[PDB]
Amino acid sequence: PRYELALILKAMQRPETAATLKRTIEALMDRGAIVRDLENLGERALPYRISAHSQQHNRGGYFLVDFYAPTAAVESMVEHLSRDIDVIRGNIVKHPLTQELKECEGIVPVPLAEKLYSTKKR
């Protein structure tokens, strides 16, 4: 199916960041993937201190990778990311654009519950 790889790389120079992206995208194609796009969200400060591969990170580059791949290729790709030191954190999720949103009409009011107790004189 269609997946999305939320990748958080390490704060590195451009020469090293390009080698990691290519190194990471070649691993997807080796597992039967069909890459579709490579979006960059920019380098920002992490919401919290992340510790990975005996390194304390405070900044990182956010990159997205939309691609198509079989179901059996996800688990094999999650292991590859773990070994890569440059990758601080990487997770795969089903692409949000392959989930049609049912049209909504509006809020339906709920009337108070009635006939919960017998109409007797207590």
């Binding site: 390009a18 290519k22 070649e26 579709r36 960059n40 969200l41």
Partner: protein
């Protein structure tokens, strides 16, 4: 119709030949998914 639309997009997919070029271009652009909303249900995208 979906197949036809797909047959057009496949041209833009990354390939081993154009992999290096796409990486460099991505490092030059930026995608912004951040946008707020008001009480009137109106989107307010940041001016950046």
């Amino acid at each position: 119709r979906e197949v036809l639309q797909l047959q057009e997009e496949v041209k833009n997919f990354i390939t081993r030949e154009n992999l290096e070029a796409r990486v460099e271009a991505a490092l030059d652009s930026r995608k912004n998914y951040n946008w707020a909303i008001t009480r009137e249900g109106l989107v307010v995208r940041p001016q950046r």
